[PDB]
C-alpha cells in the first residue's frame, strides 16, 4: 500500500534530520520511497521533506494537493515554530478544501535541556485539532518511527472511512 507523507514546519525544526533518521538510521534529496511493515501491513512510504520546496508557491500547492498525510513539526526550544503550526495546518486545509486531513503534531529536539514549549500546551493544541501529538529527537531517534507510523495509521483510518465491465464494439 502506498502512503504519501509530507513533513512541514519552520526552517530549523529538524524536518531533514527526522526524514534522514527514519530512512538512513543516523543523525540534498527532497523526496524518498522507503518500504516498511507497519502493524503487519507491507507499506511503501513516499516521504517529502519540504525544506527546499516550501519557498515555491506551485511546489507548496502541489505537495499539499498530492500529500495524503502531514507531519506538522515544531522544535520544543523555538516558540515561533510552535506558533507557525497553525499557519501550516490552515494552508493544508485550504489547498485540500477539507476539514479531515491526516496530520500528526510533532515536537522535535526533545533531547535538549532548554525547552520553551510546555508539553501541556502542545497536548492541548493536538486535542483542539483532534490529532495525535508525538515528542521526537532526530538526535537520539526517540519517537521517530512512532511519529511516521502514527501518520500512516491516520492515513489508513482516513481511507478506511473514505470507502462495471463494458463493451467498446456494442
Ligand atoms: N539536538 C537536536 N538537534 C537537532 C534535532 N533535529 C535537528 N537538529 C539540528 O537542528 C538543525 C536543523 O535541522 P534540519 O533537519 O536541517 O532542519 P529543517 O530546516 O527543519 O530540515 C540541524 O543543525 C540539526 O542537526 C534534534 O532532535 N535534536
Ligand atoms: C453487442 C452487439 C454486437 C455488435 C454483437 C452481437 C453479436 C453477434 C451478432 C454474434 C454473437 C454470436 C453468438 C451469440 C453465437
Domains in the chain with CATH codes: 2-159 (3.40.50.300)
Distance CA 141, CA 145 (A): 8
- 169 Cα–ligand 2 center, Å: 10
User: CA 109 → CA 36, 48, 123, 139, distances in Å?
Assistant: 25, 20, 16, 7
Specify the resolution in Å. Answer: 2.2
SS3 of the chain: CEEEEEEECCCCCCHHHHHHHHHHCCCCCCEEEEEEEECCEEEEEEEEECCCCCCCHHHHHHHHHHCCEEEEEEECCCHHHHHHHHHHHHHHHHHHCCCCCCEEEEEECCCCCCCCCCHHHHHHHHHHHCCCEEECCCCCCCCHHHHHHHHHHHHHHHHHHHCCCCCCCC
> Does the beta carbon of 142 lie inside 6 Å of ligand 1?
no
Ligand 2 contacts (CB < 6 A) are 167, 169-170
- 165 Cα–ligand 2 center, Å: 16
Experimental technique of record: X-ray
Residue appearing with cell numbers 526524514: 19
Distance CA 111, CA 148 (A): 18
Closest CA to 9 of 78, 57, 65: 78
Amino acid at each position: 500500500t502506498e502512503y504519501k507523507l509530507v513533513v512541514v514546519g519552520a526552517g530549523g525544526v529538524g524536518k531533514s534530520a527526522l526524514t534522514i533518521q527514519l530512512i538512513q538510521n543516523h543523525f540534498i534529496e527532497d523526496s524518498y520511497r522507503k518500504q516498511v511493515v507497519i502493524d503487519g501491513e507491507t507499506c511503501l512510504l513516499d516521504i517529502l521533506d519540504t525544506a527546499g520546496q516550501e519557498e515555491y508557491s506551485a511546489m507548496r500547492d502541489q505537495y499539499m494537493r498530492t500529500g495524503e498525510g502531514f507531519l506538522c513539526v515544531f522544535a520544543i526550544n523555538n516558540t515561533k515554530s510552535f506558533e507557525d503550526i497553525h499557519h501550516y495546518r490552515e494552508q493544508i486545509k485550504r489547498v485540500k478544501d477539507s476539514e479531515d486531513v491526516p496530520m500528526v503534531l510533532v515536537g522535535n529536539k526533545c533531547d535538549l535541556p532548554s525547552r520553551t514549549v510546555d508539553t501541556k500546551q502542545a497536548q492541548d493544541l493536538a486535542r483542539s485539532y483532534g490529532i495525535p501529538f508525538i515528542e521526537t529527537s532526530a538526535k537520539t531517534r526517540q519517537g521517530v518511527d512512532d511519529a511516521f507510523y502514527t501518520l500512516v495509521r491516520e492515513i489508513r483510518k482516513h481511507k478506511e472511512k473514505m470507502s462495471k465491465k463494458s463493451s467498446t464494439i456494442c
